Amino acid sequence: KTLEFAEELTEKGSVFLKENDFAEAVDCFSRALEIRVAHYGELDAECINAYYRYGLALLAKAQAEADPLGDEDESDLDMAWKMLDIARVITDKQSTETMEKVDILCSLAEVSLEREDIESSLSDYKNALSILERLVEPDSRRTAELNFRICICLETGCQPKEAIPYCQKALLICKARMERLSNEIKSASDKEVEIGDLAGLAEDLEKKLEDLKQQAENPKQVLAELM
């Protein structure tokens, strides 16, 4: 019932989650959240973390208990959505947007992908990216990553034309970060290793961009514009 006991439940839930004991992790995080809500209120800022942890554990559980070939799984997904969305709504009442909000939005996007809801995941990622563009440097790897996740959501959703500028942005971010590290060299070993890493990533992104431009030329994709 005390806050310290909720803290013990949270630490043990984290351990259970690392050890792939998803059921017990969800039980611990559920109990910690209930204690925190009873102390601070259902929609209080002090509960954000506990909602987030619980949502994350539920997502993990739903992913591990699904069989791709073919319910606890759908119920856990719906509850993960609920808990992460409450974390988001509470976060929305704070003046400054933080990386925790970015992360909550990315976790919500992943829930939506598991529910096969590409539109929601798209909105979640776009929101997260617009926050990230205020929080971190223009050539941040996290910004490149979110651009890429947007473009693959759009590709899987039959919108390759729209995916193209997001993939291009991810590629340009990788090359800009390359050139910036190159100028800084002008830890040196660490920067040069990262330059090579980014060059490989850029080539993978350039291949993805070629495939996207080809998909956007498919007759059904392009006829409306041609007409």
Binding site: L113, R141, R142, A144, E145, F148, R149, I152, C153, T156, A170, C174, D197, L201, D204, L205, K208
Partner: peptide, 15 residues
Amino acid sequence: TIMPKDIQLARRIRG
């Protein structure tokens, strides 16, 4: 569905 190569590339981009 999203290809596993694309998931891996997203994680590599993030690092």
